[PDB]
Amino acid sequence: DFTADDLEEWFAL
Amino acid sequence: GSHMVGQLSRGAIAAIMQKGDTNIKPILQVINIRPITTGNSPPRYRLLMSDGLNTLSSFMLATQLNPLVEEEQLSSNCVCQIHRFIVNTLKDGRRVVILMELEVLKSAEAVGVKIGNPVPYNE
C-alpha cells in the first residue's frame, strides 16, 4: 500500500 | 548476556545487505519499534532488528501486520521468524526491508533481555 517514492520520502536523509 | 545468540540467524543482516536475496527465513530479535512520521493513515512502523551479529534499522512492517504491534505480540525483545520479506534498494544504495509475513516464536516477556551485543551494520 505504498510506492517506491513513498520509501524515498520516509527514508529521506 | 550472549548465551542465547545461537537462537538468532547470525549473518542474515549482512547477507540481506550484501546480496539482497529474499529466499531465506531469518530469525531475528526486535530491538525497537517506532512509528514513521508519515502524517497520514495508516500508521506505519519502522523496526530496529538484531540477528545476534548486527543490528539494522531499515525494516518497515507491512500494514496487514499492524495488529501484532497494536496488541503487543510483536514488541521489543521478542524473537520472530520472517516468513516473507521484500528488499527495495533506494537510489542512494541503502536497502529498505519490508516485512510481509512473520511469526513471533518467543514473546518479549519470555525472552526477557536483549540477546548479545550486536553491532550496528554499517549501513
Contacts of B96 in chain A (CB under 8 A): 7, 11
Cell numbers representing residue A12 in the block: 529521506
CA dihedral defined by B87, B93, B94, B98, rounded to 10 degrees? -20
CATH of the domain at B103: 2.40.50.140
Residue B101's domain comprises 1-123
Cell numbers representing residue B4 in the block: 542465547
Render B48-76 in DSSP notation, one character per residue. Answer: EEE-SSEEEEEEEE-GGGHHHHHTTSS-T
Q: How was this structure determined?
A: X-ray
Measured in residues, chain A has a length of 13
Half-sphere exposure of A9 (CA within 13 A, CB side): 10
Question: For residue B106, which of B116, B97, B115, B119 has the smallest C-alpha distance?
Answer: B115
Contacts of B46 in chain A (CB under 8 A): 10
Percent helix, strand and coil across chain A, each rounded to 5?
A: 55, 0, 45
Structural domain count of chain B: 1
Measured CA to CA, the distance from residue B45 to residue B42 in angstroms comes to 10
Could you say which DSSP state residue B118 is in? P
- Rg (C-alpha) for chain A, rounded Å, is 7
Which of A7, A9, A13 should we substitute to test contact with B (largest number of B Cβ atoms within 10 Å)? A7
